[PDB]
């Protein structure tokens, strides 16, 4: 079995290898990359996502989210308070202000220490989940707005024809902005490209051990657990590496820098934080190996998780028994 310790693997495709996206995913899995839940892909040196970023300040963040924490430093939840719209130029200036900027630090490890010590005492503002793309239309390789769609994968593998579309999302981060422990909708893959700015640190639990993380989360967040049988779908809970280590939960960590891709694999729980002002682009995708994960994915029916139009069809076709109850949640 390849990669039996479930380490995060890093890949350096050549420009030739960068032509066929699906093929390269299947290659990485041949090497065991999925066992980690997360892989890093460093693009060939000849590749570029776009010529410059010189004109991105005019993008609008219609609903910036202030991430307010509750709990203790290593075990907390965050709620998203909606703020007034602002442009990327306004948000970048805010990120760089004395109130919100990255503190002085020695290296990534020192910064990670300061994040876990101090996160809860601040409320950074995240421009998350903005439909759009920063890939140039002329970028033909690994252009996250030109991927094969999940609907088309389900049609090719299973023959069924469904409504729905699959588009990318932009994320504008600042110091301490946080993504809570989650898997993707329907336990899909994700791919995330860090277009510019400061790094993003990731934590990940191997898919084969995801239920260990779920059981810990039920113990640490016991009222949330009674409220919903899949409350990590709410994307609000944080658990630190120290707490994970104390409770024996297998995990890995890695820092993504500008110009790098990350892939999350089906049922790979992940969480993390941004080091400073940055912009990432991410999208979900599927392969044939996903289908079985899609069929088994948990679902939030309490009503909190409230997701996309396109997830309806996935539930309806892969999980017809759950369909009814999950749609009561969504309506
Ligand atoms: O970048 C972020 O804030 C969160 N991204 C993801 O969870 C992902 O790409 O799957
Ligand atoms: Mg602009
Ligand atoms: Ni994700
Ligand atoms: Zn729920």
UniProtKB/Swiss-Prot annotation:
Recorded GO MF terms: chromatin DNA binding; damaged DNA binding; histone demethylase activity; histone H3K9 demethylase activity; histone H3K9me2/H3K9me3 demethylase activity; metal ion binding
EC annotation from Swiss-Prot or TrEMBL: 1.14.11.66
GO cellular component: blood microparticle; chromatin; nucleoplasm; nucleus; pericentric heterochromatin; site of double-strand break
Keywords attached to this entry: ADP-ribosylation, Chromatin regulator, Dioxygenase, Iron, Metal-binding, Nucleus, Oxidoreductase, Transcription, Transcription regulation, Ubl conjugation, Zinc
Co-factor requirement: Fe(2+)
Any GO BP annotation: inflammatory response
Cofactor binding: number and manner: Binds 1 Fe(2+) ion per subunit.
Modified-residue entries (PolyADP-ribosyl glutamic acid), positions: 16-17
Annotated compartments: Nucleus
Mod. after translation: Ubiquitinated via 'Lys-63'-linked ubiquitin chains. Deubiquitinated by USP14 with the help of TRIM14 leading to stabilization.
Amino-acid positions noted as binding 2-oxoglutarate in the UniProt annotation, renumbered to this chain: 126, 192, 200, 235
Domain (JmjN) ranges: 8-50
Disulfide cross-links: none
Residues reported in the UniProt entry to bind Fe cation: 182, 184, 270
Protein task: Histone demethylase that specifically demethylates 'Lys-9' of histone H3, thereby playing a central role in histone code. Does not demethylate histone H3 'Lys-4', H3 'Lys-27', H3 'Lys-36' nor H4 'Lys-20'. Demethylates both di- and trimethylated H3 'Lys-9' residue, while it has no activity on monomethylated residues. Demethylation of Lys residue generates formaldehyde and succinate.
Family per similarity comment: Belongs to the JHDM3 histone demethylase family.
Protein name: Lysine-specific demethylase 4D
Organism: Homo sapiens (Human)
């Amino acid at each position: 079995a390849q990669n039996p310790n479930c380490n995060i693997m890093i890949f350096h495709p050549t420009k030739e290898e960068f032509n066929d996206f699906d093929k390269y995913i299947a290659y990485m899995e041949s090497q065991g990359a999925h066992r980690a839940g997360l892989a890093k892909i460093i693009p060939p040196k000849e590749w570029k996502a776009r010529e410059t970023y010189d004109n991105i300040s005019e993008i609008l963040i219609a609903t910036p989210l202030q991430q307010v924490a509750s709990g203790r430093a290593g075990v907390f939840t965050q709620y998203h308070k909606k703020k007034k719209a602002m442009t990327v130029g306004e948000y970048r200036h805010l990120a760089n202000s004395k109130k919100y900027q990255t503190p002085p630090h020695q290296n990534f490890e020192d910064l990670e220490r300061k994040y876990w010590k101090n996160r809860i005492y601040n409320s950074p503002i995240y421009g998350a989940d903005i439909s759009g793309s920063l890939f140039d239309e002329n970028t033909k390789q690994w252009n996250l707005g030109h991927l094969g769609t999940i609907q088309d994968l389900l049609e090719k593998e299973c023959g069924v024809v469904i409504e729905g579309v699959n588009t990318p999302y932009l994320y504008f981060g600042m110091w301490k902005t946080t993504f809570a422990w989650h898997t993707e909708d329907m336990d899909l893959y994700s791919i995330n490209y860090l277009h510019l700015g400061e790094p993003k640190t990731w934590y990940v639990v191997p898919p084969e051990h995801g239920q260990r993380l779920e059981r810990l989360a039920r113990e640490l967040f016991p009222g949330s657990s009674r409220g919903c049988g899949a409350f990590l779908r709410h994307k609000v809970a944080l658990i630190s590496p120290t707490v994970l280590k104390e409770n024996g939960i297998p995990f890995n960590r890695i820092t993504q820098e500008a110009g790098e891709f990350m892939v999350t694999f089906p049922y790979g729980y992940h969480a993390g934080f941004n080091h400073g002002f940055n912009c990432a682009e991410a999208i979900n995708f599927a392969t044939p190996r996903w289908i079985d994960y899609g069929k088994m994915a948990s679902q939030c029916s309490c009503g909190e998780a409230r997701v996309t139009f396109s997830m309806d069809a996935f539930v309806r076709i892969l999980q017809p028994e759950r369909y009814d109850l999950w749609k009561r949640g969504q309506d």
